[PDB]
Amino acid sequence: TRPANHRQLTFEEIAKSAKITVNEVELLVMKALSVGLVKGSIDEVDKRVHMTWVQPRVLDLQQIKGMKDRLEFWCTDVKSMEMLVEHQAHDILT
């Protein structure tokens, strides 16, 4: 759900969404990582479970839409930022 902005979710949302006790979420996530559908990690001093990898899933038209939004939003930045290079050096690289 969250676009990897703060994906180091704490135990509580896991215990609520899966509605399992707090002392079992570790054993559940270690099983999921043992399977290999995710490549997160585990902290205990804060009991935050960091997320790194998610298996690629199926999506649909609207996901294609926002995806095209990211694609354009990044491509335009790439091109313009190269325009900054050429602008900064016209007769310098020959």
């Binding site: 899933r57 199926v58 790439v78 091109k79």
Partner: protein, 286 residues
């Protein structure tokens, strides 16, 4: 696996000449010849190539002809003249490879263990690297394909040799070139690199809008695989990554600083050196 190949500059010209040979038709006559290479390593070497008669209609691309007789005789001549050389694959001048192109490889996989294709581009409008080659495989899918067969992209490069670098690079005198141009080839490199980035993005968005709406197959081919491309997308500006830059950038800035420091003094020597000789030769001249 072969995993890469080294093609010499002779070929990619020994194809252009033959595309020029039957190039009078103009409309369409796909040039197909024989590729010749070396059983070098996992990596493979490509040195020689030659042509062979080939035609094909417009509709129902299943009607194409490779003279096995011509192939046998002419390769007999090229073995008599070079046993060091040998057949390795084949090529075609198609700017974009055709659906028919798999039947050709599938035909001549009996001469070579795998007659690798070679796509060349007479008019590479892209200013990147043309003349890329593929090698077919089977990738039978969960869908239930009896034989999911499709070519494979294999990285390649341009071969080199002492003599051919001599003759070619003597021919490069027709145009100017800055290959020793200090800190210029790099700038050109990032330029052409970003150009390739923008081209690829414009292509993938062309495909993506087409599939998104109206008319295109919505297969699970890439649709999530390219999503995983989005998965990486490193969030540059964050907490400790700042310490990644400022703890090294100033390091290299220090070295550059010292370099400018000595460069200034070295430039300063010649001022004394010539200001001595000028006036000392002048006062003695008068």
């Amino acid at each position: 696996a072969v995993q890469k190949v080294v093609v010499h500059p002779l070929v990619l010209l020994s194809v252009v000449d033959h595309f020029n040979r039957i190039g009078k038709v103009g409309n369409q006559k796909r040039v197909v010849g024989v590729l010749l290479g070396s059983w070098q390593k996992k990596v493979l070497d490509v040195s020689n190539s030659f042509a062979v008669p080939f035609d094909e209609d417009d509709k129902d691309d299943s009607v194409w002809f490779l003279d096995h007789d011509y192939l046998e005789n002419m390769y007999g001549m090229f073995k008599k003249v070079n046993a060091r050389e040998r057949i390795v694959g084949w090529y075609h001048t198609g700017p974009k490879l055709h659906k028919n192109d798999i039947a050709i490889n599938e035909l001549m996989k009996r001469y070579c263990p795998n007659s690798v294709l070679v796509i060349i581009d007479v008019k590479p409008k892209d200013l990147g690297l043309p003349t890329e080659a593929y090698i077919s495989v089977e990738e039978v899918h969960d869908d239930g394909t009896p034989t999911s067969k499709t070519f494979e992209h294999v990285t390649s490069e341009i071969g080199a040799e002492e003599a051919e670098e001599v003759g070619v690079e003597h021919l490069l005198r027709d145009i100017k070139d800055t290959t020793v141009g200090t800190l210029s080839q790099r700038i050109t490199n990032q330029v052409h690199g970003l150009k390739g980035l923008n081209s690829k993005l414009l292509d993938i968005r062309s495909y993506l809008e087409k599939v998104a709406t109206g008319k295109l197959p919505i297969n699970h081919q890439i649709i999530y695989q390219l999503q995983d491309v989005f998965n990486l997308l490193p969030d540059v500006s964050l907490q400790e990554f700042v310490k990644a830059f400022y703890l090294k950038t100033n390091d290299q800035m220090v070295v550059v600083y010292l370099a400018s420091l000595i460069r200034s003094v070295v430039a300063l020597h010649n001022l004394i050196n010539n200001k001595i000789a000028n006036r000392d030769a002048e006062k003695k001249e008068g």
